[PDB]
Each structure stands twice: as C-alpha cells, then as structure tokens.
Design a protein around this ligand. Structure first.
Ligand code: HEM
Length: 145
C-alpha cells in the first residue's frame, strides 16, 4: 500500500487513539450488533452492556486495536514483521468466539472513522491504500482460523 498516504492519513488520528477508536467501535456495533453481547460475556469487571463498554478492560481493547493498526502503519513497507503476531492474534480471537467475518466489518469501521476525521483529505487513493493495508492484516490473521 502507498506508505506516505497511509502515514499522513494516520497522523492526527494516532494522537487521540481512544477518541478515534471509540468512533470505530460505534460504527462496528451499528453494522454488526451481535458483537455487543460477545464483548459483554468476555467482560470480567462488569456484566451490563453499558458498564462493560465503559470499563477499563474495554477501553484497553480499544487502545489495543489502535496499537495494532499503528503497528501496521509503522511497518507498512514490510508487514512480514507482524505475520506471526497476527496469526496468533487471529487464533486468540477465534478462541474467545470472534468470527473471521467480523474483521471485514472492522475494516469498514476503520475506513468510516478515518473518513470522519479526515473529511475531504480522505481521497479514493487514501481509501484504496487503507483497504489494501487492512486487508493484508486480516489475511495474516486469517491463518488463525
Ligand atoms: C471483531 C471485533 C473484536 C472483538 C469482539 C474482539 C474481542 C476480543 C477479546 C474478547 C479479547 C480477549 C482475548 C483473550 O483474553 O484471550 C481480545 C483480545 C485482543 N484483541 Fe480483540 N476483538 C476484536 C477485534 C480486534 C481487532 C481488529 C484487533 C486489532 C486490530 C484486536 C486486538 C486485540 C488484541 C491485541 C488483543 C489481546 C490479545 C492477547 O491476549 O494476546 N481486536 N479481543
């Protein structure tokens, strides 16, 4: 994927990862509402939809998602450095009940969050680069299923 387009489009979002990751998750739950109970059942401190989603565990996972995307961005020129990490990350999600299909919905949610932050700066070339980068991340995780 075009590295300069990826790095530049990620800069501002990367500086406020919880705010932007929260936008991503809201879109994800809109597209795939069955993910909400999956998080709820995996939550340990609280039990309710709302208490789980505002919990440190859930906020931690938002940061983890953004950490992984940041790892893909900073390794865009050679994602081979994340192949084993991502295969294992896929195996881990499969074990907690996540479907591989849900990661395509995450991609749609990522693109939505970037377009919301960047507005007209999110060009079709920038979209294509992200689709290719995130697709490569999902391809590497798909080894886990
Ligand atoms: C599809 C929606 C997703 C759901 C429902 C979900 C749910 C979970 C759950 C329940 C865990 C705990 C796993 C465990 O205790 O072993 C987890 C771990 C994790 N998730 Fe996700 N996740 C999702 C998407 C993502 C994405 C897209 C990323 C990264 C881009 C990500 C990054 C992580 C990381 C880094 C961990 C910690 C893995 C570890 O324990 O080694 N998640 N996720």
């Amino acid at each position: 994927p075009e590295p300069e387009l990826i790095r530049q489009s990620w800069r501002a979002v990367s500086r406020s990862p919880l705010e932007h990751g929260t936008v991503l998750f809201a879109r994800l739950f809109a597209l795939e509402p069955d993910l909400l109970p999956l998080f709820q059942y995996n939550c340990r401190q609280f039990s309710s939809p709302e208490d789980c989603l505002s919990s440190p565990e859930f906020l931690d996972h938002i940061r983890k998602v953004m950490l992984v995307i940041d790892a893909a961005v900073t390794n865009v020129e050679d994602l081979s450095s994340l192949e084993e990490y991502l295969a294992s990350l896929g195996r881990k999600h499969r074990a907690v009940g996540v479907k591989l299909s849900s990661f395509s919905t995450v991609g749609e949610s990522l693109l939505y969050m970037l377009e919301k932050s960047l507005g007209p700066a999110f060009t079709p070339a920038t979209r294509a680069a992200w689709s290719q980068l995130y697709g490569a991340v999902v391809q590497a995780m798909s080894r886990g299923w």
